[PDB]
């Protein structure tokens, strides 16, 4: 139970049997970290459509099916709006990922995921993604580097 208005975001992870696709954020907020593909959900699209849109804007990739794998709520200290991130997964993709102004994509082997160069929360919830366990997460950050509080639980329904 997290009270107050929340802004919808998506995050997509292309997770294949032996590898995961990440993008190096090139500009803006969180520039310099590897990340899934995502952003704010817009007025007039569904959450899944927002996810597809962000993936295609940032990597050129289109997808057959996206699967809901988690929801993460973020509080940032001093910022009034909570973020409600819907996390999606796909295995099969259509096309080869291409570099955008926002993101430089690369494939990573599942034992070489660069956690020290990713958002701190990823170290906690990525293992659940890898083990195919649906989850709800909560992280309170102070700035970009410090997790002050967090909760993580497995769920039946995302």
Ligand X SMILES: O=c1[nH]cc(-c2ccccc2-c2ccccc2)c(=O)[nH]1
User: How far is 152 from 41, CA to CA, in rounded Å?
Assistant: 23
Helix, strand or coil, per DSSP, at residue 119: coil
Of the candidates 122, 121, 96, 94, the residue with the CA atom closest to the CA atom of residue 107 = 96
Can residue 121 be called a binding residue for ligand X (CB under 6 A)?
A: yes
Of the candidate residues 6, 19, 39, 49, the single one contacting ligand X (CB under 6 A): 39
Helix, strand or coil, per DSSP, at residue 149: strand
Of the candidates 21, 26, 19, 51, the residue with the CA atom closest to the CA atom of residue 36 = 21
Can residue 63 be called a binding residue for ligand X (CB under 6 A)?
A: no
For the annotated binding site for 8-oxo-ATP, the residues are 29, 37-40, 54, 58, 119-122
Which residues sit at the interface with its own copies, rule CB under 8 A? Answer: 124, 128, 133, 148-154
Which residues sit at the interface with ligand X, rule CB under 6 A? Answer: 9, 11, 30, 35-36, 38-39, 74, 83, 85, 119, 121-122
For the annotated binding site, the residues are 10, 25, 29, 35, 37-40, 54, 57-58, 102, 119-122
């Amino acid at each position: 139970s997290h009270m107050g208005a929340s802004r919808l975001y998506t995050l997509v992870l292309v997770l294949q049997p032996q590898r995961v696709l990440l993008g190096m954020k090139k500009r803006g907020f969180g520039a310099g970290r590897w990340n899934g593909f995502g952003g704010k959900v817009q007025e007039g699209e569904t959450i899944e459509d927002g996810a597809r849109r962000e993936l295609q804007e940032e990597s050129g990739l289109t997808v057959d099916a996206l699967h809901k794998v988690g929801q993460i709520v973020f509080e940032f200290v001093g910022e009034p709006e909570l973020m409600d991130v819907h996390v999606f997964c796909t295995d099969s993709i259509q096309g080869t990922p291409v570099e955008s102004d926002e993101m430089r994509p690369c494939w990573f082997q599942l034992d070489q995921i660069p956690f020290k160069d990713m958002w701190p929360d990823d170290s906690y919830w990525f293992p659940l993604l890898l083990q195919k366990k649906k989850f709800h997460g909560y992280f309170k950050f102070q700035g970009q580097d410090t997790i002050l509080d967090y909760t993580l639980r497995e769920v039946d329904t995302v």
